[PDB]
Symmetry: C2
Subunit: 171 residues, 2 copies
């Protein structure tokens, strides 16, 4: 029912979803992420942003193509809400996809934060980003199945030994 309705209750979620940890959030599989990246929804989706919520060194060691790195809430808020990324056609959808390494904590968290700020600067139902998803499994599950959609085509875990300082510096 209303379970499939997006942020402004105007319509159902466009993408097929899968079971995820957080019940209040919608999850998509690596496969759906590829379909989106290869234009299978080009007539319906006007724009989509992939928000890598991992820290800079993780992102720099290999991320999904076109993804933007926004680890801090102020960065995310600034990039997504200071100057709202509207559609080139008010008939088309704008979709946001969040993920981190495992898409367990940092990702889902950033997703809720943005929804809060979005509600704050709008007239209740209306949202700049009514449709948002979490990439299930994060980079850890996506990279090995579709390395060709990543760049550089590598993977640097948050636990990587050569960035322990950068890690706590970011904590």
């Amino acid at each position: 029912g209303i379970l499939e309705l997006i942020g402004d209750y105007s319509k159902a979620f466009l993408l097929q979803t899968v079971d995820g940890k957080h019940q209040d959030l919608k999850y998509i599989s690596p496969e759906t992420m590829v379909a989106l990246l290869t234009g299978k929804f080009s007539n319906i989706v006007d724009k989509f942003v992939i928000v890598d919520c991992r820290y800079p060194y993780e992102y720099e060691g290999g991320h999904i193509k076109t993804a933007v790195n926004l680890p801090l809430e102020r960065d995310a808020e600034s990039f997504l809400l200071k100057s709202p990324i509207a559609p080139c056609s008010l008939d088309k959808r704008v979709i946001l996809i969040f993920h981190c390494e495992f898409s367990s904590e940092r990702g889902p968290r950033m997703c809720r934060f943005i929804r809060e700020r979005d509600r704050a600067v709008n007239d209740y139902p209306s949202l700049y980003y009514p449709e948002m998803y979490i990439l299930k499994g994060g980079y850890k599950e996506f990279f090995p199945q579709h390395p060709n959609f990543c760049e550089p085509q590598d993977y640097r875990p948050m636990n990587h030994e050569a960035f322990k300082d950068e890690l706590k510096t970011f904590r």
Copy 2:
């Protein structure tokens, strides 16, 4: 019952195990792999070999420390059975651990193959390698959790686009 006994039915499996796909095989977690690598079983385990059953390009892009790359059955048979890696102390055990990228196919098969060859060159209960395990999740699960125990500290998936020919060649 005999399910908890090793190949020659002489004693129980030394390492704690976890549920894995193949019921005929014993699986260990990344955590147990680390305990073994850091000497937590040095008084009981005389020697252990980690057999990376992935293809050379995968191995070269990042593998577990001390692991040997034996993708082909002839390589594995030659390295492990042409000149049996016996213990320095008869009281001590020799353990083998197989894994591939996800540890669902290549690794388990190599593990079964070696057990067959081992049975072939012995008097029934006896085996050169009575105790063997599968690293659950393979390199995919181990690398992100313990990158410091891998070298180079990177990850090259079997699907890495720049190695499509080598994959075919090895197929």
